[PDB]
């Protein structure tokens, strides 16, 4: 007979091959569609989930009950040291798909990018791109390089650029850079290719790609949670206390007569470590790195117009399980996917962003740099030293 009381279904079947991600770094499944009216630009960037904090800001949306009021907003900080462009690739439009036509690398590729081409960099003799670079210091190889760019002027429809993260700058253990194709969306393909050929072996910072109060797409792999049951992985009802063989189960799988269990029935298995794309993440603030000028460095990242204190966004005792963010960063409203130290693809938004909330401008009043390794209660070190007074170790 039928189910007595109707109910919605546990889980979504749109995400259903709930397996471990085959990739560690989030793939851009779709780049934004270009128009040649725009100038040439990048459409993606590759950063690292540093941590979380609060923000305090005035809200200007008319009609709300929180108009001209100060909210707090959870934000993520994504440490984004500038990427280095070491290759271009063009894609021809085919009736079977979009085939990669020809890849052209740079002359000087750093050891950071060279780590990626090796499953064991200790044991190896480090021979990658050593015959490729003989194309860049003769006449005949340069003629073939020019003919490759000219052969891409005619036939390529999509031009993507190869960029890697400058991994030396981060607090991470690893020295191996993440490569990534970023679709250059802009004017005509010849102008696009001249522009990317200009940027070869060059730094591309994040203010080049993004801006403040921009809605981005954040692509990455979910924090992994293991082999989990159907009460954790699918959030079904726990069975009553009196059940014999266990209660964190799905009691009825299916009926008798479709004599298979369906794919739509929820079973136990791998929860987390899934690839996701979560959209409409507002860039509250693009931050700046530490930099030295006039001898003494200037580090005041969390300094705002209403704070005017020389603190950086690094909380007390640093970020927990991450380290110190000494580079330029993007600060994103709300939470993003992944664990800490997780490489975190940023994508410009696919959608024509036209709302009241999505076009709101941002002026922050307070970036919270209290300690997150416990209940911190002091914003900076000298505040703590002035409140507590002198200690025994002084």
């Amino acid at each position: 007979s039928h189910r007595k009381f109707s109910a919605p279904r546990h889980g979504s079947l749109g995400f259903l091959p709930r397996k471990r991600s085959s990739r560690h770094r989030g793939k851009v499944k779709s780049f934004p569609k270009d128009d040649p009216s725009k100038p040439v630009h990048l459409t993606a960037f590759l950063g690292y989930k540093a941590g979380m904090t609060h923000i305090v800001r005035e809200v200007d949306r008319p009609g709300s009950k929180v108009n001209k009021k100060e909210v707090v907003e959870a934000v993520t900080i994504v440490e984004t040291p500038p990427m280095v462009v070491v290759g271009i690739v063009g894609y021809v439009e085919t009736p079977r798909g979009l085939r990669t036509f020809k890849t052209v690398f740079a002359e000087h590729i750093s050891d950071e990018c060279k780590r990626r081409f090796y499953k064991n960099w200790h044991k190896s003799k480090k021979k990658a791109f050593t015959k490729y670079c003989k194309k860049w210091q003769d006449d005949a190889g340069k003629r073939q390089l020019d003919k490759d760019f000219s052969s891409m002027k005619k036939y390529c429809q999509v031009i993507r650029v190869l960029a890697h993260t400058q991994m030396r700058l981060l607090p991470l253990r690893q020295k191996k850079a993440h490569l990534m194709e970023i679709q250059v969306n802009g004017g005509t393909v010849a102008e696009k290719l001249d522009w990317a050929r200009e940027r070869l072996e060059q730094q591309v910072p994040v203010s080049q790609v993004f801006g403040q109060d921009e809605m981005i797409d954040v692509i990455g792999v979910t924090k992994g949670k293991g082999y989990k049951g159907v009460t954790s992985r699918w959030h079904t009802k726990k069975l009553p206390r009196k059940t014999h063989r266990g209660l964190r189960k799905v009691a009825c799988i299916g009926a008798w007569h479709p004599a298979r269990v369906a794919f739509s029935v929820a079973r136990a298995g791998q929860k987390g470590y899934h690839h996701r794309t979560e959209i409409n993440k507002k860039i509250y603030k693009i931050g700046q790195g530490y930099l030295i000028k006039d001898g003494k460095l200037i580090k005041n990242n969390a300094s705002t117009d209403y704070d005017l204190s020389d603190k950086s966004i690094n909380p007390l005792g640093g970020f927990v399980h991450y380290g110190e963010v000494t580079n330029d960063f993007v600060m994103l409203k709300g939470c993003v996917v992944g664990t800490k130290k997780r490489v975190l693809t940023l994508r410009k938004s696919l959608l024509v962003q036209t709302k009241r909330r999505a076009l709101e401008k941002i002026d922050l009043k307070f970036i919270d740099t209290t300690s997150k390794f416990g209940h911190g209660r002091f914003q900076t070190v000298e505040e703590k030293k002035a409140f507590m007074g002198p200690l025994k170790k002084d």
């Binding site: 109910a7 909210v71 707090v72 009802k237």
Partner: protein, 131 residues
């Protein structure tokens, strides 16, 4: 114009909140909450400023044994205001209030949370202190 934000609502159906006005009631037994579509196996729950269907479980005998509409005013479950403060009270409380919002009683003992008092102006006019 400005509407109510959702806050943590920790008074399901079955709660006896006390009655913070001078109708003569002492308890208010919540029998349902006004405005809930529902879902399979959930108690309808109510937070501050929720119109609720109550029952005077002790008090005056003219008030008992019938269903009263009511408004929840204090809750002991902590709820986050939009400026980022978690507020909670010393007890759960409510007042008997008709379907259009008028208070059946005259004065309100204890503070009224402003999540209620912005949304119900007659309760705010009878409110001694707010939040």
């Amino acid at each position: 114009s400005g509407a109510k934000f959702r806050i943590s609502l920790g008074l399901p159906v079955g709660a006896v909140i006390n009655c913070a006005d001078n109708t003569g009631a002492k308890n208010l037994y919540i029998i349902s909450v006004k405005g809930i579509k529902g879902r399979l196996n959930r108690l309808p729950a109510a937070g501050v400023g929720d119109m609720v269907m109550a029952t005077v479980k002790k008090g005056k005998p003219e008030l008992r044994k019938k269903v009263h509409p009511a408004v929840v005013i204090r809750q002991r479950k902590s709820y986050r205001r939009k400026d980022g403060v978690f507020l909670y009270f010393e007890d759960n409380a409510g007042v008997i209030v008709n379907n259009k919002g008028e208070m059946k009683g005259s004065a309100i003992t204890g503070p009224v949370a402003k999540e209620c008092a912005d949304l119900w102006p007659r309760i705010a006019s009878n409110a001694g202190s707010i939040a």
